[PDB]
Amino acid sequence: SHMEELQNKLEDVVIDRNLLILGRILGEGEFGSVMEGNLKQEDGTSLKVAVKTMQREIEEFLSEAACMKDFSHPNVIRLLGVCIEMSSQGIPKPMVILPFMKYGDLHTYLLYSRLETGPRHIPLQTLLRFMVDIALGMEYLSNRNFLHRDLAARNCMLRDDMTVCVADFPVKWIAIESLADRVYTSKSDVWAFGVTMWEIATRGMTPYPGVQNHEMYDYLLHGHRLKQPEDCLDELYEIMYSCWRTDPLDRPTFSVLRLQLERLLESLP
Ligand SMILES: CNC(=O)c1sc(N2C[C@H]3C[C@]2(CNC(=O)c2c[nH]c4ncc(Cl)cc24)C3)nc1C(F)(F)F
């Protein structure tokens, strides 16, 4: 039964606050903060973790976390669990526990690769491998009919073995139909994926250079799309362009995109 399966997922997702130690702030936004932490594991040893801090909304957070914790794919970030701490003002402070990624987010990695002390120049073959990794994570989520809604290179994390995983599930990433009638589908995530592939191929450029966020709906409506990057194969550009076809039904699925990206990668020496 669907209910008993949700009750199990809820029991599995909560981490006792005594098993966690909070460290330094890694990042701090408006919606919350990211801190380093230590999680005491079942095997009696501690693991370095990243801790993100934000009745109905609490239950909704828990239910959503219970679903994400259930995800099991190498290209999807693992949710280790959640804690609910209470602020001095009696305001709930939900915390989400994730593996710590020393390499950080993909967008920052890309930008650092263009600096001397940062990682070395990323070869085309490795940039394509990052695209395959994200398509695999998205294929997993779309098959489970789970919408990401904020896919961008900044929301992709690099693991220690250089595997990319999708995480955190922005006008220049939003599909033409979601700007026009609030409609959001799996084909809208395919559009954001095309935009993300373009960010990887330009090594971190902000999409639509020279175009202002308020000019975006008019720009797309008139048929304009992201331009081909200088260091990008024609085969790759066609793939990212197929993500931005006006009619969402004409856009390929993540499965189709993944296979095209894998084939192009295999074709490279
Ligand atoms: C220069 N990079 C940054 O400032 C970024 S980007 C980012 N995120 C992108 C998306 C929102 C998300 C929050 N973090 C995680 O979910 C992490 C899981 N595991 C990690 N291990 C390390 C780190 Cl740094 C982060 C995480 C995923 N968070 C930072 C942070 F933490 F520094 F504030």
Side-chain angles (χ1 to χ4, degrees), residues 132 135-136 139 239 253-266:
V132 169
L136 287 160
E139 188 180 2
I239 291 165
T253 58
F254 281 111
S255 233
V256 163
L257 285 160
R258 195 260 298 158
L259 259 120
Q260 300 165 330
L261 297 156
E262 278 203 307
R263 186 229 83 156
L264 187 54
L265 177 61
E266 225 291 286

PDB file of all heavy atoms in Angstrom, residues 132 135-136 139 239 253-266:
ATOM      1  N   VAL A 132      27.001  13.502 -20.268  1.00  0.00           N
ATOM      2  CA  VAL A 132      26.468  12.139 -20.181  1.00  0.00           C
ATOM      3  C   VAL A 132      25.995  11.874 -18.736  1.00  0.00           C
ATOM      4  O   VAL A 132      24.896  11.364 -18.540  1.00  0.00           O
ATOM      5  CB  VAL A 132      27.496  11.063 -20.646  1.00  0.00           C
ATOM      6  CG1 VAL A 132      27.024   9.641 -20.293  1.00  0.00           C
ATOM      7  CG2 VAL A 132      27.784  11.169 -22.138  1.00  0.00           C
ATOM      8  N   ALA A 135      22.764  13.706 -17.935  1.00  0.00           N
ATOM      9  CA  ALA A 135      21.662  13.064 -18.693  1.00  0.00           C
ATOM     10  C   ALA A 135      21.261  11.761 -18.000  1.00  0.00           C
ATOM     11  O   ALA A 135      20.069  11.471 -17.934  1.00  0.00           O
ATOM     12  CB  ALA A 135      22.089  12.780 -20.124  1.00  0.00           C
ATOM     13  N   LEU A 136      22.235  10.988 -17.462  1.00  0.00           N
ATOM     14  CA  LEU A 136      21.944   9.724 -16.765  1.00  0.00           C
ATOM     15  C   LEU A 136      21.151   9.980 -15.496  1.00  0.00           C
ATOM     16  O   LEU A 136      20.186   9.289 -15.254  1.00  0.00           O
ATOM     17  CB  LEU A 136      23.218   8.918 -16.450  1.00  0.00           C
ATOM     18  CG  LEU A 136      23.925   8.214 -17.620  1.00  0.00           C
ATOM     19  CD1 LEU A 136      25.371   7.891 -17.250  1.00  0.00           C
ATOM     20  CD2 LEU A 136      23.239   6.931 -17.961  1.00  0.00           C
ATOM     21  N   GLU A 139      17.612  11.098 -16.642  1.00  0.00           N
ATOM     22  CA  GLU A 139      16.888   9.914 -17.136  1.00  0.00           C
ATOM     23  C   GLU A 139      16.325   9.154 -15.930  1.00  0.00           C
ATOM     24  O   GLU A 139      15.159   8.763 -15.958  1.00  0.00           O
ATOM     25  CB  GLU A 139      17.876   9.021 -17.889  1.00  0.00           C
ATOM     26  CG  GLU A 139      17.293   7.844 -18.644  1.00  0.00           C
ATOM     27  CD  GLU A 139      18.347   7.017 -19.358  1.00  0.00           C
ATOM     28  OE1 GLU A 139      19.549   7.346 -19.238  1.00  0.00           O
ATOM     29  OE2 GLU A 139      17.972   6.042 -20.044  1.00  0.00           O
ATOM     30  N   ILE A 239      22.323  18.458 -30.761  1.00  0.00           N
ATOM     31  CA  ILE A 239      21.777  17.801 -29.591  1.00  0.00           C
ATOM     32  C   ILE A 239      21.250  18.876 -28.627  1.00  0.00           C
ATOM     33  O   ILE A 239      20.089  18.803 -28.257  1.00  0.00           O
ATOM     34  CB  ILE A 239      22.824  16.845 -28.927  1.00  0.00           C
ATOM     35  CG1 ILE A 239      23.119  15.603 -29.822  1.00  0.00           C
ATOM     36  CG2 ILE A 239      22.368  16.390 -27.531  1.00  0.00           C
ATOM     37  CD1 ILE A 239      24.423  14.803 -29.402  1.00  0.00           C
ATOM     38  N   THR A 253      13.480  12.851 -25.270  1.00  0.00           N
ATOM     39  CA  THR A 253      13.442  12.502 -23.846  1.00  0.00           C
ATOM     40  C   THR A 253      14.888  12.471 -23.344  1.00  0.00           C
ATOM     41  O   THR A 253      15.822  12.492 -24.163  1.00  0.00           O
ATOM     42  CB  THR A 253      12.832  11.130 -23.670  1.00  0.00           C
ATOM     43  OG1 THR A 253      13.627  10.198 -24.417  1.00  0.00           O
ATOM     44  CG2 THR A 253      11.344  11.071 -24.100  1.00  0.00           C
ATOM     45  N   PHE A 254      15.083  12.363 -22.009  1.00  0.00           N
ATOM     46  CA  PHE A 254      16.409  12.235 -21.433  1.00  0.00           C
ATOM     47  C   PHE A 254      17.087  10.969 -21.881  1.00  0.00           C
ATOM     48  O   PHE A 254      18.286  11.008 -22.156  1.00  0.00           O
ATOM     49  CB  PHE A 254      16.419  12.386 -19.901  1.00  0.00           C
ATOM     50  CG  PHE A 254      16.346  13.840 -19.479  1.00  0.00           C
ATOM     51  CD1 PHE A 254      15.204  14.347 -18.863  1.00  0.00           C
ATOM     52  CD2 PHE A 254      17.434  14.683 -19.648  1.00  0.00           C
ATOM     53  CE1 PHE A 254      15.148  15.670 -18.437  1.00  0.00           C
ATOM     54  CE2 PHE A 254      17.361  16.016 -19.263  1.00  0.00           C
ATOM     55  CZ  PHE A 254      16.221  16.508 -18.660  1.00  0.00           C
ATOM     56  N   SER A 255      16.316   9.880 -22.042  1.00  0.00           N
ATOM     57  CA  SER A 255      16.822   8.608 -22.549  1.00  0.00           C
ATOM     58  C   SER A 255      17.445   8.746 -23.948  1.00  0.00           C
ATOM     59  O   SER A 255      18.547   8.264 -24.179  1.00  0.00           O
ATOM     60  CB  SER A 255      15.696   7.590 -22.617  1.00  0.00           C
ATOM     61  OG  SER A 255      16.121   6.444 -21.914  1.00  0.00           O
ATOM     62  N   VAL A 256      16.738   9.423 -24.866  1.00  0.00           N
ATOM     63  CA  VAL A 256      17.209   9.661 -26.232  1.00  0.00           C
ATOM     64  C   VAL A 256      18.457  10.524 -26.227  1.00  0.00           C
ATOM     65  O   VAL A 256      19.446  10.169 -26.859  1.00  0.00           O
ATOM     66  CB  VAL A 256      16.075  10.202 -27.124  1.00  0.00           C
ATOM     67  CG1 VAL A 256      16.620  10.824 -28.396  1.00  0.00           C
ATOM     68  CG2 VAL A 256      15.070   9.079 -27.430  1.00  0.00           C
ATOM     69  N   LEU A 257      18.429  11.606 -25.471  1.00  0.00           N
ATOM     70  CA  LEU A 257      19.583  12.524 -25.340  1.00  0.00           C
ATOM     71  C   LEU A 257      20.801  11.820 -24.802  1.00  0.00           C
ATOM     72  O   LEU A 257      21.888  11.997 -25.339  1.00  0.00           O
ATOM     73  CB  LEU A 257      19.245  13.684 -24.429  1.00  0.00           C
ATOM     74  CG  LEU A 257      18.357  14.746 -25.008  1.00  0.00           C
ATOM     75  CD1 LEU A 257      17.708  15.550 -23.883  1.00  0.00           C
ATOM     76  CD2 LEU A 257      19.145  15.668 -25.937  1.00  0.00           C
ATOM     77  N   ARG A 258      20.612  10.996 -23.773  1.00  0.00           N
ATOM     78  CA  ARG A 258      21.681  10.260 -23.138  1.00  0.00           C
ATOM     79  C   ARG A 258      22.399   9.359 -24.136  1.00  0.00           C
ATOM     80  O   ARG A 258      23.622   9.292 -24.118  1.00  0.00           O
ATOM     81  CB  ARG A 258      21.120   9.437 -21.983  1.00  0.00           C
ATOM     82  CG  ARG A 258      22.206   8.931 -21.031  1.00  0.00           C
ATOM     83  CD  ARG A 258      22.525   7.486 -21.343  1.00  0.00           C
ATOM     84  NE  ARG A 258      21.361   6.624 -21.155  1.00  0.00           N
ATOM     85  CZ  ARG A 258      21.211   5.441 -21.721  1.00  0.00           C
ATOM     86  NH1 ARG A 258      22.153   4.954 -22.519  1.00  0.00           N
ATOM     87  NH2 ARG A 258      20.109   4.737 -21.508  1.00  0.00           N
ATOM     88  N   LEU A 259      21.626   8.633 -24.952  1.00  0.00           N
ATOM     89  CA  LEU A 259      22.138   7.717 -25.964  1.00  0.00           C
ATOM     90  C   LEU A 259      22.881   8.496 -27.040  1.00  0.00           C
ATOM     91  O   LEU A 259      23.928   8.038 -27.467  1.00  0.00           O
ATOM     92  CB  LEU A 259      20.964   6.905 -26.608  1.00  0.00           C
ATOM     93  CG  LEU A 259      20.732   5.468 -26.150  1.00  0.00           C
ATOM     94  CD1 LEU A 259      19.311   5.284 -25.546  1.00  0.00           C
ATOM     95  CD2 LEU A 259      20.723   4.525 -27.352  1.00  0.00           C
ATOM     96  N   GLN A 260      22.366   9.666 -27.476  1.00  0.00           N
ATOM     97  CA  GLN A 260      23.074  10.497 -28.472  1.00  0.00           C
ATOM     98  C   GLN A 260      24.405  11.018 -27.884  1.00  0.00           C
ATOM     99  O   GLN A 260      25.434  10.999 -28.565  1.00  0.00           O
ATOM    100  CB  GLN A 260      22.214  11.676 -28.985  1.00  0.00           C
ATOM    101  CG  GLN A 260      20.911  11.240 -29.667  1.00  0.00           C
ATOM    102  CD  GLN A 260      19.891  12.341 -29.851  1.00  0.00           C
ATOM    103  OE1 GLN A 260      19.807  13.289 -29.068  1.00  0.00           O
ATOM    104  NE2 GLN A 260      19.063  12.230 -30.889  1.00  0.00           N
ATOM    105  N   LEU A 261      24.387  11.453 -26.618  1.00  0.00           N
ATOM    106  CA  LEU A 261      25.613  11.947 -25.978  1.00  0.00           C
ATOM    107  C   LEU A 261      26.654  10.831 -25.796  1.00  0.00           C
ATOM    108  O   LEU A 261      27.824  11.053 -26.089  1.00  0.00           O
ATOM    109  CB  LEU A 261      25.326  12.700 -24.664  1.00  0.00           C
ATOM    110  CG  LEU A 261      24.498  13.958 -24.836  1.00  0.00           C
ATOM    111  CD1 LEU A 261      23.790  14.297 -23.579  1.00  0.00           C
ATOM    112  CD2 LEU A 261      25.337  15.097 -25.321  1.00  0.00           C
ATOM    113  N   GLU A 262      26.213   9.627 -25.412  1.00  0.00           N
ATOM    114  CA  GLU A 262      27.091   8.464 -25.242  1.00  0.00           C
ATOM    115  C   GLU A 262      27.741   8.024 -26.544  1.00  0.00           C
ATOM    116  O   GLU A 262      28.917   7.656 -26.546  1.00  0.00           O
ATOM    117  CB  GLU A 262      26.351   7.293 -24.607  1.00  0.00           C
ATOM    118  CG  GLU A 262      26.285   7.433 -23.104  1.00  0.00           C
ATOM    119  CD  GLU A 262      26.071   6.128 -22.367  1.00  0.00           C
ATOM    120  OE1 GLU A 262      25.109   5.396 -22.698  1.00  0.00           O
ATOM    121  OE2 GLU A 262      26.869   5.841 -21.446  1.00  0.00           O
ATOM    122  N   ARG A 263      26.967   8.033 -27.634  1.00  0.00           N
ATOM    123  CA  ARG A 263      27.426   7.676 -28.967  1.00  0.00           C
ATOM    124  C   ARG A 263      28.474   8.696 -29.454  1.00  0.00           C
ATOM    125  O   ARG A 263      29.527   8.295 -29.952  1.00  0.00           O
ATOM    126  CB  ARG A 263      26.238   7.591 -29.939  1.00  0.00           C
ATOM    127  CG  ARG A 263      26.625   7.086 -31.327  1.00  0.00           C
ATOM    128  CD  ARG A 263      26.073   7.964 -32.421  1.00  0.00           C
ATOM    129  NE  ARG A 263      26.928   9.123 -32.665  1.00  0.00           N
ATOM    130  CZ  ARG A 263      26.963   9.803 -33.807  1.00  0.00           C
ATOM    131  NH1 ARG A 263      26.187   9.446 -34.826  1.00  0.00           N
ATOM    132  NH2 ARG A 263      27.780  10.840 -33.944  1.00  0.00           N
ATOM    133  N   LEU A 264      28.193  10.006 -29.302  1.00  0.00           N
ATOM    134  CA  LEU A 264      29.135  11.054 -29.665  1.00  0.00           C
ATOM    135  C   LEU A 264      30.447  10.894 -28.853  1.00  0.00           C
ATOM    136  O   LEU A 264      31.541  11.000 -29.413  1.00  0.00           O
ATOM    137  CB  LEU A 264      28.511  12.438 -29.399  1.00  0.00           C
ATOM    138  CG  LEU A 264      29.294  13.637 -29.871  1.00  0.00           C
ATOM    139  CD1 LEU A 264      29.639  13.532 -31.361  1.00  0.00           C
ATOM    140  CD2 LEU A 264      28.539  14.921 -29.564  1.00  0.00           C
ATOM    141  N   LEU A 265      30.328  10.613 -27.546  1.00  0.00           N
ATOM    142  CA  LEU A 265      31.493  10.429 -26.685  1.00  0.00           C
ATOM    143  C   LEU A 265      32.340   9.235 -27.185  1.00  0.00           C
ATOM    144  O   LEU A 265      33.526   9.403 -27.447  1.00  0.00           O
ATOM    145  CB  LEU A 265      31.060  10.266 -25.223  1.00  0.00           C
ATOM    146  CG  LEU A 265      32.149   9.988 -24.184  1.00  0.00           C
ATOM    147  CD1 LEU A 265      33.162  11.107 -24.119  1.00  0.00           C
ATOM    148  CD2 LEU A 265      31.542   9.734 -22.827  1.00  0.00           C
ATOM    149  N   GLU A 266      31.700   8.076 -27.410  1.00  0.00           N
ATOM    150  CA  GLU A 266      32.357   6.879 -27.925  1.00  0.00           C
ATOM    151  C   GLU A 266      33.056   7.135 -29.276  1.00  0.00           C
ATOM    152  O   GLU A 266      34.149   6.622 -29.486  1.00  0.00           O
ATOM    153  CB  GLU A 266      31.380   5.702 -27.997  1.00  0.00           C
ATOM    154  CG  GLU A 266      31.962   4.398 -27.468  1.00  0.00           C
ATOM    155  CD  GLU A 266      33.074   3.776 -28.300  1.00  0.00           C
ATOM    156  OE1 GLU A 266      32.771   3.214 -29.378  1.00  0.00           O
ATOM    157  OE2 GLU A 266      34.250   3.850 -27.875  1.00  0.00           O
TER     158      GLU A 266
END
